[PDB]
CSV table of C-alpha atoms in Angstrom, one decimal:
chain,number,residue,atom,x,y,z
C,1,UNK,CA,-95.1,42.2,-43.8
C,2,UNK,CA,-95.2,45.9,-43.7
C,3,UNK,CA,-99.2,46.1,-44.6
C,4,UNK,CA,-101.0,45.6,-41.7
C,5,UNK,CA,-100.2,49.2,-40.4
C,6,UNK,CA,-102.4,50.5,-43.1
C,7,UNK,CA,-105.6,48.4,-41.9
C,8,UNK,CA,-105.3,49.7,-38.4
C,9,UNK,CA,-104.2,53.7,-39.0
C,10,UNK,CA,-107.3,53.0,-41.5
C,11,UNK,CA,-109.8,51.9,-39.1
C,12,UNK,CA,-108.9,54.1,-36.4
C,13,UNK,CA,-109.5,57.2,-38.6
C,14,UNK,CA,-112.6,55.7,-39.4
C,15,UNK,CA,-113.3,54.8,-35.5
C,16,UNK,CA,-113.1,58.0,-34.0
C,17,UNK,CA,-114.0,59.7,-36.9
C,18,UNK,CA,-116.9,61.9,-35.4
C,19,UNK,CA,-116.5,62.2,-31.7
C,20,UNK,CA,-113.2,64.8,-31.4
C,21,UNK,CA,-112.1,62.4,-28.2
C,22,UNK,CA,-108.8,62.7,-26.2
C,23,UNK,CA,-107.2,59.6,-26.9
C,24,UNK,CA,-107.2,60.8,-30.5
C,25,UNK,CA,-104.8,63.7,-30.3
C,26,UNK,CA,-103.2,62.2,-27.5
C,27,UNK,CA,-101.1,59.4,-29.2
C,28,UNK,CA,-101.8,60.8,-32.5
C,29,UNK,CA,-99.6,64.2,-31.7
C,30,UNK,CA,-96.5,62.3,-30.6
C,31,UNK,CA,-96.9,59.6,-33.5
C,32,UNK,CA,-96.0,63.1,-35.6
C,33,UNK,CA,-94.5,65.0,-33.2
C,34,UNK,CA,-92.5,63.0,-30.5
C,35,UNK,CA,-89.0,62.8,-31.8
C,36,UNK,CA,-88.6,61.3,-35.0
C,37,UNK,CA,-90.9,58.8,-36.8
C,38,UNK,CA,-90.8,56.3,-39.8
C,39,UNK,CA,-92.3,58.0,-42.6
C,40,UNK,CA,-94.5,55.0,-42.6
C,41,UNK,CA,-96.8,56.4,-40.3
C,42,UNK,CA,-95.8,59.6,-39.2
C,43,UNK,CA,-97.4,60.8,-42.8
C,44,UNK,CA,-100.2,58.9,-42.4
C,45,UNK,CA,-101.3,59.2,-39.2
C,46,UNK,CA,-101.0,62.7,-39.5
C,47,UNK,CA,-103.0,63.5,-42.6
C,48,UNK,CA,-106.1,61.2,-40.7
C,49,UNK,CA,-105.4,64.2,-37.9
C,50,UNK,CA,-106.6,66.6,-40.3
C,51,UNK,CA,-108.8,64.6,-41.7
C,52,UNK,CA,-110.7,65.0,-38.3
C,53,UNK,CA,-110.4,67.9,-37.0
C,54,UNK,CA,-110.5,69.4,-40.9
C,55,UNK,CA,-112.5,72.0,-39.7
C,56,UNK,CA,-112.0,73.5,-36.3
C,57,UNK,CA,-107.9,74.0,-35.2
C,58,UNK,CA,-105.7,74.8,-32.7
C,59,UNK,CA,-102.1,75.7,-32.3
C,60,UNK,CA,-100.7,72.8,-30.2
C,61,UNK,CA,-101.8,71.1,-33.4
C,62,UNK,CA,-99.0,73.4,-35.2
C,63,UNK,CA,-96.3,73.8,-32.6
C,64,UNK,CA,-96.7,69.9,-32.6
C,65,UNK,CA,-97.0,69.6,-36.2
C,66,UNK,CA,-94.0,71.6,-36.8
C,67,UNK,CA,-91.4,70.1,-34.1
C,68,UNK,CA,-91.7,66.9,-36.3
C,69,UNK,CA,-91.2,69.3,-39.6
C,70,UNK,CA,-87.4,69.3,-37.9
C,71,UNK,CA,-86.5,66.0,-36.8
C,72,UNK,CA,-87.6,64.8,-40.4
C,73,UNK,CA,-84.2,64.4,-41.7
C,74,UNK,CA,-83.6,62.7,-45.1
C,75,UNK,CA,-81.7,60.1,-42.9
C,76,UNK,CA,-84.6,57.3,-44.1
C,77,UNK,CA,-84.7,57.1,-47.6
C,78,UNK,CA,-85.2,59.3,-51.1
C,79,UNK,CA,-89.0,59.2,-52.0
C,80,UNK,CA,-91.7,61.9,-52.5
C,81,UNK,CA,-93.9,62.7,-50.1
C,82,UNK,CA,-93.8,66.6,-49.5
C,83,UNK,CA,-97.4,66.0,-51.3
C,84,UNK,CA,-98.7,64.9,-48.2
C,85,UNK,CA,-97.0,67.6,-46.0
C,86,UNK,CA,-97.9,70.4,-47.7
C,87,UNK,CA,-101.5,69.2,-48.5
C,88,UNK,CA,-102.3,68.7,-44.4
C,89,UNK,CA,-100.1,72.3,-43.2
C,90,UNK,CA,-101.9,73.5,-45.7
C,91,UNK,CA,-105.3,72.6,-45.2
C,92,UNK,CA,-104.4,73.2,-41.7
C,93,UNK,CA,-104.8,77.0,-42.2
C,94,UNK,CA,-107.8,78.8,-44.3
C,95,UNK,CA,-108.1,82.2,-41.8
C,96,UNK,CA,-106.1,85.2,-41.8
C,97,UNK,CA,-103.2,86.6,-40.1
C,98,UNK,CA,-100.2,86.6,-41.9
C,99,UNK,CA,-100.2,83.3,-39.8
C,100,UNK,CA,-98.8,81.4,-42.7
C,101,UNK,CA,-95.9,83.9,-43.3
C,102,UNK,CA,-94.8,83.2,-39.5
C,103,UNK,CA,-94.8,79.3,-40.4
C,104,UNK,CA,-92.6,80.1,-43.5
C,105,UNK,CA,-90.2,82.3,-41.2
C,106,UNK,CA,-89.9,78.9,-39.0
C,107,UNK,CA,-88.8,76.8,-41.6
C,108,UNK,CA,-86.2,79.7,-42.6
C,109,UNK,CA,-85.2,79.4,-38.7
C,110,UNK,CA,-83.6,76.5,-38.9
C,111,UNK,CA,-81.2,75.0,-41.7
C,112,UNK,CA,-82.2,74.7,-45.0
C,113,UNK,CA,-82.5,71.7,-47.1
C,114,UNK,CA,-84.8,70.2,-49.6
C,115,UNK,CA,-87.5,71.8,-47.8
C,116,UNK,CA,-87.2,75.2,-49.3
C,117,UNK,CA,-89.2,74.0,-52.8
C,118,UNK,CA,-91.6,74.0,-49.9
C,119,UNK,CA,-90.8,77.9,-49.1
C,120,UNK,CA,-91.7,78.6,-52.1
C,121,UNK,CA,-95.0,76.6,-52.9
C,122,UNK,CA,-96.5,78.1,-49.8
C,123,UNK,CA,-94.7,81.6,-49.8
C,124,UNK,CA,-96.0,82.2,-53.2
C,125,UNK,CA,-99.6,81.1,-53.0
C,126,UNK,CA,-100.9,83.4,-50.2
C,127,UNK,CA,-103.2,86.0,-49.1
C,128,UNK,CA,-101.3,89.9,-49.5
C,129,UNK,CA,-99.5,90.1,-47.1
C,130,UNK,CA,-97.1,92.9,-47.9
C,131,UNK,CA,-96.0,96.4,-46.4
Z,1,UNK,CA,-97.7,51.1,-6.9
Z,2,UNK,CA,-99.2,49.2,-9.5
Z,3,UNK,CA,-98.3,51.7,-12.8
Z,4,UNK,CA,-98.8,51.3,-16.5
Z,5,UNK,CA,-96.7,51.8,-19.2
Z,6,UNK,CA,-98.3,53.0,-23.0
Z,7,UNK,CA,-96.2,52.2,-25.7
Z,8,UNK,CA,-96.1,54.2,-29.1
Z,9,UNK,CA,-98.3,51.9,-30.8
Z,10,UNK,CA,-100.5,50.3,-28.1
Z,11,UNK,CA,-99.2,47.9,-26.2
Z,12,UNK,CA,-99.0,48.2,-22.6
Z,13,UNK,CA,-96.9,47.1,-19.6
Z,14,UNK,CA,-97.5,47.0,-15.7
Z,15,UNK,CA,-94.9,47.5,-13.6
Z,16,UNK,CA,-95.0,47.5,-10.1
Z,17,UNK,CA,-93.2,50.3,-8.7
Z,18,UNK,CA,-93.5,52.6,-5.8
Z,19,UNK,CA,-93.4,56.4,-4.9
Z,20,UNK,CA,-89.3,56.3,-4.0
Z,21,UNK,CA,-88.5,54.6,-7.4
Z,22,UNK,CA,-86.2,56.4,-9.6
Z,23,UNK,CA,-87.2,56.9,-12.7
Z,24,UNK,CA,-83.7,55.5,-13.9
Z,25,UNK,CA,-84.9,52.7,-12.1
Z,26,UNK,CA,-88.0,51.7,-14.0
Z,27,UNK,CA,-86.2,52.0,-17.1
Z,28,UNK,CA,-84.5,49.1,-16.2
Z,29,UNK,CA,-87.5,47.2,-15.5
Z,30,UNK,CA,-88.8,48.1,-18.6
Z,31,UNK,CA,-85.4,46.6,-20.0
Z,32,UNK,CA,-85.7,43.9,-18.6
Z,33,UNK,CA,-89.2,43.3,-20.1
Z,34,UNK,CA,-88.9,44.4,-23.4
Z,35,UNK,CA,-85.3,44.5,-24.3
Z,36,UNK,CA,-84.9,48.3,-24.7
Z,37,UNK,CA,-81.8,49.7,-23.5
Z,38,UNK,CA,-82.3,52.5,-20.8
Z,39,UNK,CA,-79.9,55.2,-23.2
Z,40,UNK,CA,-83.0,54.7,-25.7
Z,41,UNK,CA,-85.9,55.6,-23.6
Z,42,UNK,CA,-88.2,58.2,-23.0
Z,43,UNK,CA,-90.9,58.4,-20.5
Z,44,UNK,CA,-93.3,61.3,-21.4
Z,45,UNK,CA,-96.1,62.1,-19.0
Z,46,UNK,CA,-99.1,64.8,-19.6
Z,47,UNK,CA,-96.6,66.4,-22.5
Z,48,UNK,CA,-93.5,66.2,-20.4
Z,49,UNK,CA,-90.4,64.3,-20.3
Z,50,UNK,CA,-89.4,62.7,-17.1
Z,51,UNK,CA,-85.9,64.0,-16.2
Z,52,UNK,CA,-83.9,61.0,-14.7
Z,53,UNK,CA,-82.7,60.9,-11.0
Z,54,UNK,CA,-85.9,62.0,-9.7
Z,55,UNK,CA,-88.8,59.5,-8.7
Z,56,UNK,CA,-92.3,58.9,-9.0
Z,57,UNK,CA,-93.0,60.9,-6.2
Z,58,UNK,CA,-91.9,63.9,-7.5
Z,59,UNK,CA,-94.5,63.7,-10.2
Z,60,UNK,CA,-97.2,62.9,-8.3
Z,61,UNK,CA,-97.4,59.6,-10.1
Z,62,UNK,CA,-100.0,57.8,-8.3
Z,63,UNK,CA,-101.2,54.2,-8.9
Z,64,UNK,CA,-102.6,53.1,-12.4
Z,65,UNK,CA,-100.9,56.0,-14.3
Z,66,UNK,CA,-100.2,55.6,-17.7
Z,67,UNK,CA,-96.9,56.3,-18.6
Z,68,UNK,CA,-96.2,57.9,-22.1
Z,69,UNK,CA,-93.5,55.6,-23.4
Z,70,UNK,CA,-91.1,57.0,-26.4
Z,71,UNK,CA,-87.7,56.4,-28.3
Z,72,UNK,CA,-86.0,59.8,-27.9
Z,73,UNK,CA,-83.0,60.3,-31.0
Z,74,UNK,CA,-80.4,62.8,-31.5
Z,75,UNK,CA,-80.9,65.8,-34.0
Z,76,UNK,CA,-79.0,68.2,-35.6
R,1,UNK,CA,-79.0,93.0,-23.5
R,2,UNK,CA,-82.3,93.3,-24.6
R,3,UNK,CA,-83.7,90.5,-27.0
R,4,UNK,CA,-87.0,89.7,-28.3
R,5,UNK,CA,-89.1,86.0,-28.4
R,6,UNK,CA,-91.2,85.1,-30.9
R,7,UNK,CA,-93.5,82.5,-30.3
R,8,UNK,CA,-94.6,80.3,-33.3
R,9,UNK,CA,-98.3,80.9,-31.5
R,10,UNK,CA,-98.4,84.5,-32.0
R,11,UNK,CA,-96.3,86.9,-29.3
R,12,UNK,CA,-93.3,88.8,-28.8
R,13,UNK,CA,-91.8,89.0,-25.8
R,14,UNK,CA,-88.9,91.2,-24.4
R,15,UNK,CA,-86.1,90.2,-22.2
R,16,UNK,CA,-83.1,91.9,-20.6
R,17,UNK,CA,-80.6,89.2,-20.6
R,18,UNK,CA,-76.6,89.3,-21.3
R,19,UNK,CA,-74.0,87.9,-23.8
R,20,UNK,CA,-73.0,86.0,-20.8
R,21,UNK,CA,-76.6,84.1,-20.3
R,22,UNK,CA,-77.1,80.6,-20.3
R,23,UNK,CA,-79.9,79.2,-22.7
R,24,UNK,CA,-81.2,77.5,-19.8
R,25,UNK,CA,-81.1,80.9,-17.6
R,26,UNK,CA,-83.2,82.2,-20.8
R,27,UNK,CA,-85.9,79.8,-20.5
R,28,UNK,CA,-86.8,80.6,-16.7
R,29,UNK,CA,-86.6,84.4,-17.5
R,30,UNK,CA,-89.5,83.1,-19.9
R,31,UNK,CA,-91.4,80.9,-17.4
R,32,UNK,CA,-91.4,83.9,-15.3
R,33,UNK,CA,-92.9,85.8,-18.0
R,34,UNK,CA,-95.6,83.6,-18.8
R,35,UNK,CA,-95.9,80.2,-17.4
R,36,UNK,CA,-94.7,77.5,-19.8
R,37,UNK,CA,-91.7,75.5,-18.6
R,38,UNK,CA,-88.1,75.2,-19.2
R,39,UNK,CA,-88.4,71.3,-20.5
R,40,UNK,CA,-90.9,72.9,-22.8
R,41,UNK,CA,-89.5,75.6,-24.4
R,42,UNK,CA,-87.7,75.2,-28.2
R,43,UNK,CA,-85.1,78.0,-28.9
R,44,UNK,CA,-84.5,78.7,-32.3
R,45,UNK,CA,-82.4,81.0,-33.9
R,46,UNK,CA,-80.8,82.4,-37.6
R,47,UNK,CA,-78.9,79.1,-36.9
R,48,UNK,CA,-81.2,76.1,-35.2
R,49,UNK,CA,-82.6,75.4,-32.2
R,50,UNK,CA,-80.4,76.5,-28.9
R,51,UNK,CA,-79.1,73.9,-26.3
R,52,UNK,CA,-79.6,73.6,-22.7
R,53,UNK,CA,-76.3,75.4,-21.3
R,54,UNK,CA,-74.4,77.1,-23.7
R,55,UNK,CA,-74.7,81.1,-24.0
R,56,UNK,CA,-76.0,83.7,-26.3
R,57,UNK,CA,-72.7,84.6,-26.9
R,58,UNK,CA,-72.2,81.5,-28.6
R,59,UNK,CA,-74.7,81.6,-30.9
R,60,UNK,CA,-73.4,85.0,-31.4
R,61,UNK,CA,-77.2,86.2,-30.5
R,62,UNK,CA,-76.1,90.1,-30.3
R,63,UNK,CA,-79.4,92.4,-29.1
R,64,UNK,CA,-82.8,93.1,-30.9
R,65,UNK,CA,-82.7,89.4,-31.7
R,66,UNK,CA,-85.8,87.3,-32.5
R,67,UNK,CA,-86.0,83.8,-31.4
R,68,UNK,CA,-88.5,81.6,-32.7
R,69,UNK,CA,-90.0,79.8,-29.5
R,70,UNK,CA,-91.9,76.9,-29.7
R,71,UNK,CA,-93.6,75.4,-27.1
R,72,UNK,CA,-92.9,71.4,-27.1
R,73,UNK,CA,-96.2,70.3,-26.6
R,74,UNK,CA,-99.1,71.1,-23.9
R,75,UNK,CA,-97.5,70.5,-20.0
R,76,UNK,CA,-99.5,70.5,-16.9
């Protein structure tokens, strides 16, 4: 009956939709960023993040962000969805800094899987950011 | 002590402890409610895990806290 | 041994440690640096992320190193 998860992540980014609460970020974070989440909602619920707080930003938003980045291992199941990853990370960014070049050098940290059409995307599309 | 327990959805759970309860402790009356083994738990409190052995006391955990529950996995 | 952290925020810092230095001895050098603690500190190097207790000689982390440190969420 996997459905009714859509109704509620649904409403809820509807519900606190203009208010920038606590209780948003607060179980919204570790839904993406705790320690491993079913694809089901850990996409979701943090594209609604964005959707939010599209404007402003921060970087517990990030450091959070990015620990899930890690513990998403292809251990679920094959489908596509670095659509959604790389649309939020990357919406998630707009200034400049070579902010996005740090992020890159992250995913480089660790090991390197299916990920890296990802280093590429980004890493190509990007303000200079050379010498 | 009267606390409260968050699950990673919603659903909440009240369990009366005290201040010299092990954490290890309410684990297991969490197990006993649910059915969660203590080996997969997580309790997470103002961004912090709760290391085990310790007790409520340590964290200042007063009365009518709510406990961050989570389902910590291995990695790689 | 001198070795440099980079945090995913935006910082560099430099630490004197040795070859014979536990990851967990890293991370207080680090809370004494700034503030953030142990339990929230993610060391990550040209391999992955750094356990609690081994060395930096078994990562092979020789000196002018960068790790990537990543701070596991706020923690009051």
């Amino acid at each position: 009956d996997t459905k009714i998860s859509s109704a509620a992540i649904l409403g809820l980014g509807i519900a606190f939709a203009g208010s920038k609460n606590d209780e948003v970020l607060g179980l919204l974070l570790p839904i993406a960023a705790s320690t491993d989440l079913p694809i089901e909602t850990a996409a979701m619920a943090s594209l609604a993040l964005a959707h939010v707080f599209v404007g402003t930003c921060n970087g517990d938003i990030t450091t959070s962000i990015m620990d899930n980045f890690l513990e998403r291992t292809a251990i679920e199941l094959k489908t596509d969805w670095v659509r959604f990853l790389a649309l939020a990370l990357g919406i998630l960014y707009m200034g400049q800094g070579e902010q996005v070049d740090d992020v890159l050098e992250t995913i480089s940290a660790i090991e390197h899987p299916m990920t890296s059409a990802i280093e590429v995307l980004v890493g190509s599309c990007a303000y200079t950011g050379t010498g | 002590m009267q606390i409260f327990v968050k699950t990673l959805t919603g659903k909440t759970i009240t369990l009366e402890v005290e201040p010299s309860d092990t954490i290890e402790n309410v684990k297991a009356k969490i197990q006993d409610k649910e059915g969660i083994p203590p080996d997969q738990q997580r309790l997470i409190f103002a961004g912090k895990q709760l290391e085990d052995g310790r007790t409520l006391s340590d964290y200042n955990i007063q009365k009518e806290s709510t406990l961050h529950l989570v389902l910590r996995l291995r990695g790689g």
